[PDB]
Amino acid sequence: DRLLNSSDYTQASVCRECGSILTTQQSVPRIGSISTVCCRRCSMRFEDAKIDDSQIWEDGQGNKFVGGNETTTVAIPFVLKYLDSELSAMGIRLRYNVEPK
Amino acid sequence: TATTLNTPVVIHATQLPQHVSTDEVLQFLESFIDEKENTNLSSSISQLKRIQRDFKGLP
Amino acid sequence: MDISKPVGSEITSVDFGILTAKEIRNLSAKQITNPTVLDNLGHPVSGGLYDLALGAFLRNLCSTCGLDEKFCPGHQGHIELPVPCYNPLFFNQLYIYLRASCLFCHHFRLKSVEVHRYACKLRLLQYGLIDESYKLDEITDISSTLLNELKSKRSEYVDMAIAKALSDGRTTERGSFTATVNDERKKLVHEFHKKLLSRGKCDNCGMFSPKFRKDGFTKIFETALNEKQITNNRVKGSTYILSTEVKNILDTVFRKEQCVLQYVFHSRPNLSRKLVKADSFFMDVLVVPPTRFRLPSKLGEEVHENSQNQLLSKVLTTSLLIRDLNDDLSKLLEDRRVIFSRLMNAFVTIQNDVNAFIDSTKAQGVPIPGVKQALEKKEGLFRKHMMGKRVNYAARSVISPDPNIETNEIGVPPVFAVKLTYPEPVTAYNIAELRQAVINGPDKWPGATQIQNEDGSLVSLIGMSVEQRKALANQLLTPSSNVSTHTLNKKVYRHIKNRDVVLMNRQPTLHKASMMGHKVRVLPNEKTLRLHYANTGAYNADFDGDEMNMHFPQNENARAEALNLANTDSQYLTPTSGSPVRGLIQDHISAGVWLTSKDSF
Amino acid sequence: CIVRVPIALYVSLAPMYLENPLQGVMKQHLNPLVMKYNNKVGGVVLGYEGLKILDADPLSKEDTSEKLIKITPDTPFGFTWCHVNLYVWQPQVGDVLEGYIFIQSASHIGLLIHDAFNASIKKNNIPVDWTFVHNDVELGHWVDSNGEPIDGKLRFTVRNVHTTGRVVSVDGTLIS
Amino acid sequence: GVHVSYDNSIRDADGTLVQFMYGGDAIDITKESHMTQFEFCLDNYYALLKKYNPSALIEHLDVESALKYSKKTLKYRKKHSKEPHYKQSVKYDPVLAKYNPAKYLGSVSENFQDKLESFLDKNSKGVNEKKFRALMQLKYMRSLINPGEAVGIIASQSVGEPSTQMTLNVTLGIPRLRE
Amino acid sequence: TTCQFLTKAVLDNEREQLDSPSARIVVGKLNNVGTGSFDVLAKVPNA
Amino acid sequence: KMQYFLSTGNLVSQSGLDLQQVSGYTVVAEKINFYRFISHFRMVHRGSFFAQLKTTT
Amino acid sequence: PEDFQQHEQIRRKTLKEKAIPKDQRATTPYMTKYERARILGTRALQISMNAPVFVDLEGETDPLRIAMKELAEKKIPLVIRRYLPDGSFEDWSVEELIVD
Amino acid sequence: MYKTEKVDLALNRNRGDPITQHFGFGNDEWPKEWLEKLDEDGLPYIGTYVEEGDPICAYFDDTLNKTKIKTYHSSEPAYIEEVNLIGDESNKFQELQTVSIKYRIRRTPQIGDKF
DNA sequence: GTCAAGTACTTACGCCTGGTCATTACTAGTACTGCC
DNA sequence: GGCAGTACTAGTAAAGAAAGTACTTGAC
RNA sequence: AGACCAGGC
Ligand SMILES: Nc1nc2c(ncn2[C@@H]2O[C@H](COP(=O)(O)CP(=O)(O)OP(=O)(O)O)[C@@H](O)[C@H]2O)c(=O)[nH]1
Ligand SMILES: [Mg+2]
Ligand SMILES: [Zn+2]
Ligand SMILES: [Zn+2]
Ligand SMILES: [Zn+2]
């Protein structure tokens, strides 16, 4: 309660096959569609992957490309998300493997 | 919408699907509506009754 | 944390690895290239350290996810370092394998049957086989007919030892790793590196390699191979070397000797079967952090860019200098004589910049702090923001003594009784007392300050009148008009009452009884916490200006612990000696001498 | 083309269904699942059948009524694995379906499938040798090569399936 | 991370084992105050019987087994233990390592068994002799340490806080603890 | 000496099972001592 | 540059003086009291080098 | 459907191997001070979220006081899963565990 | 307890550019609620009781054409004792841009105060 | 192989409250003015 | 009337008094 | 957010 729940509680979305806190991001949907959470590392460019019309998502750049929809939210402290940003600045890859896969 | 209160956390297919004929569907739809009336899926029951009456009759 | 917003998955483990450069070109949002942070009229220039592709910045939507400042998580980008440069975290371990390796056959300078002896001892230590790794020395100028046969007997002994222990209920295929097998693994790798570095000739093909000189960081020097032992190079049938050449050597060493370094660089068995590469010691691409985590130092008009932007600007300035230095090699003797002596000068300064970004003390140059020094000491990241944290829902004020308090209570002021609040979800048994709590409003004790709806929405009661506030009290227990929120109920942030729990705490908390759990009894007059005298022996708290903290827990799992488990009635006996710490102190002891006297009638 | 998938799904359980665990997994997770497209199933879930909650202790039997649900430490909700047989209507490309006519327009023939699911056959999917006559009064009809109005059924090959929006839509072509 | 496990065997957080039993007897310091205060507990027998309640707790316990082996090792050790420790062909574990003391009534330590029978021999004194030893053995069992006690924190605060009772030709005090 | 134990952890490719109370506060788990030394299960009545 | 020395206490010297410390030469005269105010003009200090030092003598 | 089925049968076989049977369990027959603090806590979160209450309310408005009342008549439908350091566990219901 | 803060209106510009912020009220529809604390020149009256949220000075702006007030950023109520007008010294004569306001706070000895 | 000493990096009580100051040289440019 | 000298201006570039281990280099 | 200074227990 003190060291997490009332200081920096956040429910951050985590890629299940990357184990990455700060890789995934919100997709930019079309009109009428709903946005989904999607990963950047285990994705693939659409020109590289030559599809099933639902795994294809798109950036805010208009960069439309198909890939990682294996993501979920886990409740972490927010300073862990800053710890990965400093370790990836060094070149350290923390992998957060979640239990329901 | 799109919460752990609504959606499953993880969803997987346990076994490969195989097709069912018209007899298994009409036995399902006579049992699925029976076990459901006896909730905002009433708008979906209205679409289930269209399919149940389609394999039995004609609108 | 909302108890009405559960979370599904859980981090069970973590593990450490190195970003390869292929990942951080796929992970990346946008490669950033020019060393100008933001141009005139305050706009972040496209391709700079502040870019809209790396996150929403200062009332300007992100170019990757299209969200504003409040909802963009921040996105990573990268830069392209033109030369493979040293990672200063791994330079001490690179320099061991930079040495101790033959520059001619690209093995290490040991004999290849003794390097194999550690590969089969460290494979046993990946599994829980600390005993069988000493039985492997029992398997025991010299022709290669039997050394090829000795490597078969040591390898078949391991393949028989691993398969038996994995069937004799002892080791999973993920490998058993305990504390005392971490002892004999660190002991064996330190035996391995100390014996690699002490070699004269390569014991595979017998000739010398020119020794290396570590000037400090940022540089590397090969020394002069003497005239006495260039004869051995002729019977086999000083210079600053480039960082591109060191990677060329060590990519060849790690392929001729891949089968040993799978077990030196892995504690647990490598189930992914990935190669270990010498590119993993270098870094060819810097990862720029998201622009959320490097916002500028804003103080009125005194806007200074972050210290990481000042270090990453110098890496990009040097990266465009060397791009404009290699534009003369396409133009092409004096024009070649001076342009290469300044190109090799630019090789050192881009290494000296990638040092200063990661570590401010490995950078020759009051200096700007690096990524290492935001983590290290008190005022680091682990000690200042992970092991200790600033907290919400917590108070601190001076203490005054108070009898007529039932010795398991703290006397809370009205001004903490109004600000501190607790989320009660509404039920059939709260709508008696929690309908009156919302009607009383944020300033009447006992009252409430906010209503959390079923939807996660949150309605403040501060700027409201009593007629609007009686309408929300009848709307308080209503069935949901949404299917996706049908099992939830409203939470009323009531004020702290006479039934809540409180953690009291005086620094230094030298033992666990200096942080106890008290009941609360509000008092109507002044602004000080009020403590009974039996608690003063445990907190070591006189009343000459002591102030002590007050933490208010926000769920029923922590209310049940601070009433039953960390309770102040449970802490009568300290666990140091078993002697009590709670008891009456100064006036109550001199009174009992007079009250229990024979004269007292 | 209605097909049967057996699934294994990891759901929540609010404390109000701690006396009726089968009734709660249906109302929270399975009743919002009917008549919607689902990515990890293949098509549109018509209904479900045979819900079984995986008990948390393995020492018990499947005959027992009292089962165990693991409570989250922070929140009072319980998480569990469940087995249930979904029945799902999935269309795929290549297959030919009966189509009841819903809208006859000059650009997009919007028709129904099994009186529920919307579909579309564009004008470029219609070959050139068919004509559309006007309806100036109130939406006419397309004239085929037989010189007759098309009406009722229309067997067409599935060209593309568009599932990203609110409901599913089926793109239809008329070449075979 | 050092804590009592449900084995009554205190150990580190990763799983490695520091001791096999807390202090050799698995009893809490905040409960062993009146454990050997026998003449206090005899005068207050009928009032301590209301909080330990012996006959109501016979059902969920094993009373028969641990008391037999506590007599097969007490009688064995009084016959021996004239010779020193290296000569002792021991042949019998202590009863506290063979039986779980939180479950078996009568699995006590040896100096609790030796001090009980020394009290129960010197002064012989309406409570009889067998009701008094059957209440100290349930008081010992209730004075067991609970599994989950963060012991290594308690053991580190039991040194660092009394070290601040020193402040605030042999070396002595806080420089001795530094060494 | 954080980034000396950091380099030794990444050159071992060391996986840690989040056992120490220090490792569970960094990643945000419930602590394995005292109250978090067990789970709590709920007996639901129906199948 | 003399207003900077008084406002901060930092000693900026190209040929550093015979002093061990480099900062903390000026102190705000409080006037929080007259006992406080007259005590600023009678105080001696050994140096800030000796403060960050774990000796007693 | 083939990788997950084999992964599910390994996830449910090891968790059966860790399950110590009811006749072969060896921990204490008492509900410890930590198990009492979490039984009263996890139940009081459920009472506050409209779980069915098995005891008559005598005008109690505090969810933690209701949880203390349900423990006195042993009406709490919760189970303690006591983990061993092997990863194995026992299962103790609240009606089995005797207090103090 | 006496507490003095300097209200400086000329710290966001340089080198003779025209002053965009003038003390006093403007011609816009600014609320008549703060005639009570403030005088016609955008300065507060002497002796007025000021709790948190009350304005301490009014100034008209030119790049926004709106009268903004600076407010009392302290949760302990005070009384305004004196208002100085710190005129700038220059060869060209300038409209006022710096005003020093002094507060007084009644510290009646409450309990918890050290004697 | 070897002990050997010099060198290099490493920590050094907890919490809390105020207050202040904070880039400098210079260098090229546009404008001001004295001039014939 | 317009030329060139200065005085400024805003502009963009450089900034000597604690105790422990681990390690290489070091004679022999 | 830092550095320095002045303090509280
Ligand atoms: N952890 C720290 N605690 C401190 C420090 N300085 C003071 N203190 C606390 O402040 C208190 C200071 O007590 P005093 O210096 O007044 C000794 P005193 O004779 O006045 O005690 P009494 O006779 O009980 O009045 C003491 O309880 C300490 O716990 C410090 O530097 N660190
Ligand atoms: Mg004091
Ligand atoms: Zn991924
Ligand atoms: Zn974004
Ligand atoms: Zn060689």
mmCIF file of C-alpha atoms in Angstrom, chain C residues 440-525:
data_model
loop_
_atom_site.group_PDB
_atom_site.id
_atom_site.type_symbol
_atom_site.label_atom_id
_atom_site.label_comp_id
_atom_site.label_asym_id
_atom_site.label_seq_id
_atom_site.Cartn_x
_atom_site.Cartn_y
_atom_site.Cartn_z
ATOM 1 C CA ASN C 440 -22.233 16.701 4.930
ATOM 2 C CA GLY C 441 -19.817 17.566 2.141
ATOM 3 C CA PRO C 442 -16.053 18.022 2.042
ATOM 4 C CA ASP C 443 -15.825 20.355 5.049
ATOM 5 C CA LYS C 444 -18.191 18.926 7.688
ATOM 6 C CA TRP C 445 -16.923 16.122 9.806
ATOM 7 C CA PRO C 446 -17.964 13.315 9.346
ATOM 8 C CA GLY C 447 -18.154 13.864 5.623
ATOM 9 C CA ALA C 448 -16.932 12.920 2.165
ATOM 10 C CA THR C 449 -15.015 14.697 -0.564
ATOM 11 C CA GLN C 450 -15.429 12.670 -3.793
ATOM 12 C CA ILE C 451 -17.689 10.055 -5.367
ATOM 13 C CA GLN C 452 -16.129 7.525 -7.703
ATOM 14 C CA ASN C 453 -18.772 6.306 -10.133
ATOM 15 C CA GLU C 454 -19.055 2.776 -11.491
ATOM 16 C CA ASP C 455 -17.489 3.962 -14.770
ATOM 17 C CA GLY C 456 -14.214 4.954 -13.112
ATOM 18 C CA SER C 457 -15.413 8.558 -13.323
ATOM 19 C CA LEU C 458 -14.783 10.739 -10.303
ATOM 20 C CA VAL C 459 -17.049 13.555 -9.122
ATOM 21 C CA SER C 460 -15.692 16.200 -6.777
ATOM 22 C CA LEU C 461 -17.912 17.617 -4.040
ATOM 23 C CA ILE C 462 -15.808 20.721 -3.433
ATOM 24 C CA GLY C 463 -17.507 23.294 -5.633
ATOM 25 C CA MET C 464 -21.060 22.169 -4.864
ATOM 26 C CA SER C 465 -24.014 23.431 -2.840
ATOM 27 C CA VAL C 466 -26.133 21.423 -0.419
ATOM 28 C CA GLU C 467 -29.143 21.171 -2.751
ATOM 29 C CA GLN C 468 -27.017 19.705 -5.544
ATOM 30 C CA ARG C 469 -25.374 17.495 -2.925
ATOM 31 C CA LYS C 470 -28.615 15.913 -1.693
ATOM 32 C CA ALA C 471 -29.375 14.913 -5.290
ATOM 33 C CA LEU C 472 -26.139 12.917 -5.530
ATOM 34 C CA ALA C 473 -26.970 11.145 -2.257
ATOM 35 C CA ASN C 474 -30.124 9.573 -3.704
ATOM 36 C CA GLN C 475 -28.288 8.725 -6.956
ATOM 37 C CA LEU C 476 -25.682 6.974 -4.783
ATOM 38 C CA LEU C 477 -27.271 3.503 -4.582
ATOM 39 C CA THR C 478 -28.788 3.002 -8.041
ATOM 40 C CA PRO C 479 -28.561 0.011 -10.389
ATOM 41 C CA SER C 480 -26.191 0.358 -13.310
ATOM 42 C CA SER C 481 -27.379 1.633 -16.686
ATOM 43 C CA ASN C 482 -24.417 -0.105 -18.346
ATOM 44 C CA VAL C 483 -23.974 -3.829 -18.893
ATOM 45 C CA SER C 484 -20.155 -3.792 -18.782
ATOM 46 C CA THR C 485 -20.229 -2.238 -15.286
ATOM 47 C CA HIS C 486 -23.193 -4.115 -13.814
ATOM 48 C CA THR C 487 -21.303 -5.773 -10.955
ATOM 49 C CA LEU C 488 -19.615 -2.588 -9.720
ATOM 50 C CA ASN C 489 -20.805 -0.079 -7.148
ATOM 51 C CA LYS C 490 -20.019 3.537 -6.385
ATOM 52 C CA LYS C 491 -17.168 4.405 -4.041
ATOM 53 C CA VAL C 492 -17.670 7.333 -1.680
ATOM 54 C CA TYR C 493 -14.423 8.862 -0.450
ATOM 55 C CA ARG C 494 -15.557 9.387 3.124
ATOM 56 C CA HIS C 495 -13.495 11.240 5.694
ATOM 57 C CA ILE C 496 -11.493 9.388 8.318
ATOM 58 C CA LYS C 497 -13.804 8.390 11.182
ATOM 59 C CA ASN C 498 -13.385 7.060 14.709
ATOM 60 C CA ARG C 499 -13.253 3.488 13.349
ATOM 61 C CA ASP C 500 -10.379 3.718 10.860
ATOM 62 C CA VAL C 501 -6.770 2.625 11.300
ATOM 63 C CA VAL C 502 -3.568 4.672 11.116
ATOM 64 C CA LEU C 503 0.146 3.931 10.922
ATOM 65 C CA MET C 504 2.146 6.186 13.209
ATOM 66 C CA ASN C 505 5.868 6.520 12.657
ATOM 67 C CA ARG C 506 8.778 8.470 14.142
ATOM 68 C CA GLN C 507 12.218 8.701 12.529
ATOM 69 C CA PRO C 508 14.578 6.977 13.076
ATOM 70 C CA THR C 509 12.618 3.727 12.896
ATOM 71 C CA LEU C 510 15.446 1.775 14.470
ATOM 72 C CA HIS C 511 13.200 -1.203 15.244
ATOM 73 C CA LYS C 512 9.803 -2.384 14.082
ATOM 74 C CA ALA C 513 7.919 -1.088 17.139
ATOM 75 C CA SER C 514 8.796 2.456 16.057
ATOM 76 C CA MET C 515 6.105 2.064 13.363
ATOM 77 C CA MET C 516 2.842 0.805 14.862
ATOM 78 C CA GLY C 517 -0.836 0.827 14.012
ATOM 79 C CA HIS C 518 -3.197 2.971 16.072
ATOM 80 C CA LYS C 519 -6.925 3.416 16.105
ATOM 81 C CA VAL C 520 -8.232 6.923 15.474
ATOM 82 C CA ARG C 521 -10.303 9.187 17.697
ATOM 83 C CA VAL C 522 -10.778 12.670 16.269
ATOM 84 C CA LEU C 523 -10.350 15.674 18.496
ATOM 85 C CA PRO C 524 -12.128 18.965 17.800
ATOM 86 C CA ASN C 525 -9.608 21.697 18.619
#
